[PDB]
Write a structure and sequence with these properties.
Three copies of one chain form a homotrimer. The first copy, chain A, is mainly alpha-helical. Chain A has one domain (about 10-415): Sodium:dicarboxylate symporter (Proton glutamate symport protein, Orthogonal Bundle). In chain A, about 80% of the residues lie in helices and about 0% in strands. The first copy, chain A, has helices at about 1-10, 10-30, 35-55, 55-70, 75-105, 130-135, 140-145, 150-170, 175-220, 225-250, 255-275, 275-290, 295-310, 310-330, 335-350, 355-370, 375-385, 390-415. Chain A is globular, with a radius of gyration of 22 Å. Chains in contact: A-B, A-C, B-C. The complex binds aspartic acid (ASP) (3 copies) and sodium ion (6 copies). One aspartic acid binds near residues 276, 313 and 400 of chain C. Chains A, B, C: One of its GO terms (cellular component) is plasma membrane. Chains A, B, C: Keywords: Amino-acid transport, Cell membrane, Chloride, Membrane, Metal-binding, Sodium, Symport, Transmembrane, Transmembrane helix, Transport. Chains A, B, C: It is found in: Cell membrane. Chains A, B, C: It comes from Pyrococcus horikoshii (strain ATCC 700860 / DSM 12428 / JCM 9974 / NBRC 100139 / OT-3). Chains A, B, C: Pfam families: SDF.
């Protein structure tokens, strides 16, 4: 039947067909002013795909991390954490530098007609760092699970797994049996979640088509002029990030880039369409599992990187800061560029793994170089950037997920 | 001792004694203007009974559905879903038609003195259907469990059970063992919940007495005149719904109606007193379990029907729409009656399984026939209806639960 | 290394060093007006310790209580509950009487210069008792777990454990196996939580230092004059409560007070610094486990007492009521003193196990003797008391936890 024929077709080809055709359809409909129709009837399928992916985030993350922490010694986990944090920081700094270079090679926003009088934006307020750090520890793990909050779930899961391992080495028979039973149940939950991810990827092509079509119909028509040059700068910078950092590092550490891409294509495409690292996390974790990476490594690195490691976001923040600076006519000094590097790395760390968060966090980077959002001209340039936010978000989320996978693979190789 | 004597007495007789005596006491106290006293000291016992029943809804539903979906093939589950949805729609349409017939045989609200100047009601706003459908898929299953949300729990539980079955057929020993352990733990939780339901049914008589007494003391004195004819129409229609639909269908499909009633009496009485299908769900599921129905069928059908299958609600909506129409003096044409049938079926589907929801959803049916709640006269008639809402809600919730059980039994017989 | 040397050092000595040095440092810094600096950089470590302790409350309570109720017959549980409630009420009444005696021996607030014009306080409103009692039964156990709510969790856990035991005695093999698996998994979770408590107690010294330093720097400088006499009355009364009630009862029932103190020192110190019985509950439960007390007793008594049994709170409420009365110049009659005893016992029962709750609940006791917070003078005295609230809260929380442990030990001995 038709359903059997659809299911039997390879998932990669279906996803690619959906992506290309959704792009074409969305562009055509947007030019012809049917973006409202696309939002009304096409978007819900993509929303369903996104919801299905998000449904699996907390269970898979919690269960897989508990099992992995149970299967890995604490010292090794600490070494892995140190290595992955170093990799995260270095890659984010390199991404911001590459974005600045791309902005300087081109000149997005130079000699741009700026129109004042649009919507205003409230100045970015620095949240207290101490509160952010303390929030890593949950006051109620059940509440953290019920309210999302991936990072506190990670903390509690690691602690629980270490405790379970310590119990499984005890002298009491009953304690050992109870710990074994709990661990087996949690592992069963994790495997069930991975199977469900397999199932959802079959519906993935329809959601991919819908999401890309909506994004095109809503924003692609706005990719013209200075905004087109911004988009080109960002996307060339993302491509260079991939080729110069991830490919080179995989070559250095002995990982075949071609096999890596073959394994990671599904996660990359899901990140591209959903624009959510957190939402794409189940697919990324399945990719790591298929790569043969130990659970104790990826179950910890990928959920953490989905929040704190965003190379594409950092590159985009740098490029957009330079664009807004040129639009205002101001020139950024070398010290200001280094301030941009530091602040964009920090903002990328603080950016949530959800659509549109990087554009919001760009305000902190802009403020760091004396470009407050309260200024009417800065507000106008920021509004211009926000118009094509989803277009850039697709690529930058894709690069974020790709970098997370590259780091996980490298760290696994080193262990 | 007294406690032992109370516990040893049959539960059915205790519940019936409580029901009759609470009805008498509440009526007498209401006539004598002691409804405040009943609300203050008698109602809390019924509130406790309701809370105890609601405590078991989410765990029993989730665990039983996971186990049942694990024990049933997906194809069979789909066939069962199709059959049960067909039965739901047909029975709801028949219920609305029967309500219209009862309204036309009598004439509730004909020549009624209508007084304007009471409370006004905001016009019913149609919620977006796409959002309602999307909400079936939870973005966080833990959040869905923690916030009620039976339908998303059903979705996630079915998916999890199917995945667990697929794991239990794998070639890996460890995966099979982990899936077995998880399934066994969930099944233990479900059986514990059923035992707790058994325990709560022992306290049920006191709560039944309290609830019926409060309802009588608060609203029975208002059942006079045109409202008495409305109540008679609704209750005769509900009785006819039972006898003409459920009894006849059980006879057709070979199920003995007498044995069915003997098994289902506890759920029917609990629904009558609590006026909550969702709250009565644990008792209904226990009834189905005692009937010998397979878990894979009832664990799916009953939680779904508790939301989307409400024959009594549909019949009540039709009768009340006709009552409000006569009160306004307007005459409903045949096409308007068919509009009423369709819209009342839709409203019954959308009505929540909680007390008083059907009266709220009646606004959509009224609007469908050009009787907006903004009109002062429509508002007056609606307020008159709301005065005896609980009296009608008892019977209509009872019929809703009875129809859910009848459909589950028929579908089980056909499989 | 330094970390190994720190970890190897005995936990008791580390905690004591931290306590003493934090007290000294906080006092010195507060005199020198650096309380802001202590709040900014020192307090976060104590906040981290408190958060880590609170992270374990719900899982440990739920799992341990389920296991204990499964391991104990319902009749024995009822007998234990009756005994512990009797002990709670008697000890709280004695504590209030002792506080009144201490207030009368000294004269806190006598001849005190009262300044009007400060912040006003809204009159205490008596919450409905029926709603409070009904809230003991949760409408959703998952929601109760996710939102804290220790008491509903206790109720559901006891019910679940009893049901599990009844299942483990069934004739069905599958039901018995499923119940066994569920119980084993829950027990594994409980043991893991206890191990995590062991781990957190290693960091406890730093948090103790930080918390005591902040409390001193913020409020100790205010302990002068009439407030110093209030503090002396409260602390002498707490010491007398310990020695006259807990020590004497332990001697009577054959429990060695010295061994009891050696086992309970960690919980006592944690309660002293955190000022939260609920937050200290994991440490208290670990203390009871190390004492050899059966899980079926302590897993029920300690979580319940952490809410409803607060001797230190009752004593503090009595002392502060007398202080406010003298400050106003009013004289309390014997009947008013007995009203104080009853109302302070009730307020201590209703006081939450969190910092500063007893001061809030003191309003009910004050109102019971015609000292409404709306009066400007009563408001001034209340504000004066609130200035040193944390100083008194430390000791009163310590005494609350000590009394809970004493009652658990006595009840265990009697069984
Ligand atoms: N949407 C991106 C973050 C961003 O907005 O830049 C992500 O989820 O990774
Ligand atoms: N209370 C009914 C719905 C209604 O209000 O009609 C039920 O729970 O089934
Ligand atoms: N903080 C105390 C209660 C109080 O405020 O008196 C406790 O947790 O026990
Ligand atoms: Na990075
Ligand atoms: Na981030
Ligand atoms: Na129906
Ligand atoms: Na409904
Ligand atoms: Na007490
Ligand atoms: Na209390």
């Amino acid at each position: 039947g038709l359903y059997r024929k659809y299911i039997e077709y390879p998932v990669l080809q279906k996803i690619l067909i959906g992506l290309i055709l959704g792009a074409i359809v969305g562009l055509i409909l947007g030019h012809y002013g049917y973006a409202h129709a696309v939002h009304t009837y096409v978007k819900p399928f993509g929303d369903l795909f996104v919801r299905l992916l998000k449904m699996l985030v907390m269970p898979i993350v919690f269960a897989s991390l508990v099992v992995g922490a149970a299967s890995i010694s604490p010292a090794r986990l600490g070494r892995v954490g140190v290595k992955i944090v170093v990799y995260y920081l270095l890659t984010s700094a390199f991404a911001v530098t590459l974005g600045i270079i791309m902005a300087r090679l081109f000149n997005p926003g130079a000699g741009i007609h700026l129109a004042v009088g649009g919507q205003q934006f409230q100045p970015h307020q620095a949240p207290p760092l101490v509160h952010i750090l303390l929030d890593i520890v949950p006051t109620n793990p059940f509440g953290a699970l019920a309210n999302g909050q991936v990072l506190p779930t990670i903390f509690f899961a690691i602690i629980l797994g270490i405790a379970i391992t310590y119990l499984m080495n005890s002298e009491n028979e009953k304690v050992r049996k109870s710990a074994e039973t709990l661990l087996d149940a949690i592992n069963g939950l994790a495997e069930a979640m991975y199977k469900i991810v397999n199932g959802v990827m079959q519906y993935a092509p329809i959601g991919v088509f819908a999401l890309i079509a909506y994004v095109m119909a809503e924003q692609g028509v706005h990719v013209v002029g200075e905004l087109a040059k911004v988009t080109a700068a960002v996307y060339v910078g993302l491509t260079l990030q991939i080729l110069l950092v991830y490919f080179v590092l995989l070559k250095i550490y002995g990982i075949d880039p071609i096999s890596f891409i073959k394994h990671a294509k599904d996660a990359m495409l899901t990140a591209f369409v959903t624009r959510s690292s957190e939402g794409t996390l189940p697919v990324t974790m399945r990719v790591a599992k298929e790569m043969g990476i130990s659970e104790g490594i990826y179950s910890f690195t990928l959920p953490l990187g989905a929040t704190i490691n965003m190379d594409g976001t950092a590159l985009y923040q740098g490029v957009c800061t330079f664009f807004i600076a040129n639009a205002l006519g101001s020139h950024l000094t070398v010290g200001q560029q280094l301030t941009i590097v530091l602040t964009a790395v920090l903002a990328s760390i603080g950016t949530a793994g959800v659509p549109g968060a990087g554009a919001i966090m760009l305000a902190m980077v802009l403020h760091s170089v004396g470009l407050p959002l309260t200024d009417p001209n800065v507000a106008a340039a920021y509004a211009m950037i926000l118009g094509i936010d989803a277009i850039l978000d697709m690529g930058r989320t894709m690069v974020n997920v790709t970098g997370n996978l590259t780091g996980t693979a490298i760290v696994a190789k080193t262990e």
